[PDB]
């Protein structure tokens, strides 16, 4: 077909201010180029159709350009509203679509808010153990998490999950939950999450005993 | 071989694309 | 007033068959040629299927090619989408997209569509209970398939409330919820999580407990 | 699409290369 290579893969802006996507097409595509925005839970929009033409509605903050293989399309003026994932289109030669552009905000590097928690009573009726870890409203989004129990440092049975960008606070958040059997947990006594930020050069420690 | 259309719209599109092809949705 | 509404979606064993619908109006519907776009796991947009304004032509890429069928009653103003053989690459949100040109310039809100062997599970709902602030959670493990809804105090709890994104392990999905309150309601007030799963037909409130 | 605009009747050569690929 023809490939769009779409440029960057994610991007963080801050109100007000402006951004700048691109795609590269494989081949010569005569401005036959739309942009869409697409937000979580609703369907795509269309924004700009052959390179530069918007849509009736759409807000003149948004602008597109280029020819022949290489294209851009701009923000100005951002705006909440506008925090959302953007795809180019060629159409010149059948359809094909751009990886996408995740654009969110940027905010003041906040610290994570660190919590534990040891398996309910519910849980190791069942015969299982889950202990868990939120590193809620932290930036920006990428962190590490570390866990250690009795000082071992272990692994296996942990797996981890995250939150895009909260629409409160603009902060991401992350999951970490390891996991054992009803006697693995027994067994030992002394269980910490470590989240490591590059808030702090500390990492934020919480833990808990027998108890 | 023969021809669908009175307009003879195939061997018209065969002209007017060549190897390109057609989509039967127009781009503008 | 365009508007694009799909249904049908659900989930489907490897094998099966399934078919989606899309009901249009607020415009000429047998004026405009037609197409199906899914959006895979990974967030790519992928033309799955593209029909003429009067059903003359169609179009379908050579990963749906013999399997996909996409047809039209225009007078009855609603786009179908008959899928059959399906795989777990079919996994998707399917979206309905009109094409006055060849771009698209409409889309429905979807329907998400799953493709698994996996068996439906009903959830374990766990409580999760360790300043001017505390932070609770529920945790939500073992369940097939996607998805579960969390609310607290019946949904009357709303800030800090952060609902993470389940993973997929063995063939089942654990999710955690979290909810920080202020220290003067709880212990001294209950909040409990509300699970609700419909595809189990799953509704649990997990009342935290000190 | 093409086959219901342009074969009842003769599309101009403009028309008919808006459809090409
Ligand atoms: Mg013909």
């Known amino acids: 077909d023809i490939q769009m290579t779409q440029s960057p893969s994610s991007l963080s802006a801050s109100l007000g201010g402006r951004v700048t996507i691109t795609c590269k097409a494989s081949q010569d595509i005569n401005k036959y180029l739309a942009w869409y925005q697409h937000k979580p839970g609703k369907g795509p929009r269309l924004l700009i159709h052959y390179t530069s033409t918007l849509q009736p509605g759409i807000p003149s903050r948004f602008s597109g350009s280029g020819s022949g293989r290489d294209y851009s399309f701009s923000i100005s003026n951002l705006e909440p509203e506008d925090v959302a994932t953007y795809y180019c289109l060629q159409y010149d030669s059948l359809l094909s679509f751009g990886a996408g552009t995740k654009l969110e905000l940027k905010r003041a590097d906040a610290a994570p808010t660190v919590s534990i928690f040891p398996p309910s009573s519910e849980q190791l009726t069942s015969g299982g153990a889950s202990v868990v870890c939120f590193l809620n409203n932290f930036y920006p989004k990428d962190i590490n998490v570390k866990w250690k129990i009795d000082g071992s440092e272990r692994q296996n049975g942990v797996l981890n999950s995250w939150t895009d960008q909260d629409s409160k606070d603009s902060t991401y958040s992350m999951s970490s939950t390891l996991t054992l059997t009803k006697d693995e947990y027994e067994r030992h006594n002394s269980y910490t999450c470590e989240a490591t930020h590059k808030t702090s050069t500390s990492p934020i420690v919480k833990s808990f005993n027998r108890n | 071989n023969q021809h669908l259309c009175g307009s003879h719209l195939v061997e018209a599109l065969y002209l007017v694309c060549g190897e390109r092809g057609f989509f039967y949705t127009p781009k503008a | ?210 | 699409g093409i086959v219901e605009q342009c074969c009842t009747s003769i599309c101009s050569l403009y028309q008919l290369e808006n459809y090409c690929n």
Not at chain 3, 4 to 15: A, D, I, N, T
Not at chain 3, 83 to 99: F, H, V
Request: with cysteine; net charge neutral; hydrophobic share 30%.
């Open chain 3, 1 to 210: 007033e365009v508007q694009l509404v799909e249904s049908g979606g659900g989930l489907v064993k490897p094998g099966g068959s399934l078919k989606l619908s899309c009901t249009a109006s607020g415009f000429a519907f047998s004026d405009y040629d037609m197409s199906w776009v899914r959006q895979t796991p990974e967030k790519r947009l992928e033309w799955v299927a593209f029909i003429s304004n009067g059903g003359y032509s169609t179009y379908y890429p050579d990963t749906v090619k013999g399997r996909f069928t996409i047809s039209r009653d225009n007078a009855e103003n609603t786009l179908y989408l008959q899928m059959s053989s399906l795989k777990s690459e079919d996994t998707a949100i399917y979206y309905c997209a009109r094409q006055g040109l060849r771009y698209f310039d409409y889309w429905g809100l979807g329907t998400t569509l799953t493709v698994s062997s996996a068996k439906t599970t009903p959830p374990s709902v766990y409580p999760l209970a360790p300043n001017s602030m505390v932070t609770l959670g529920c945790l939500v493990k073992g369940y097939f398939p996607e998805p579960v809804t969390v609310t607290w105090n019946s949904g009357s709890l709303s800030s800090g409330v952060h609902t993470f994104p389940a993973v997929l392990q063995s063939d089942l999905y654990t999710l955690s919820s979290s909810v920080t309150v202020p220290s003067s309601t709880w212990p001294s007030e209950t909040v409990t999580c509300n699970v609700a799963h419909p595809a189990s037909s799953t509704k649990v409130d997990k009342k935290i407990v000190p």
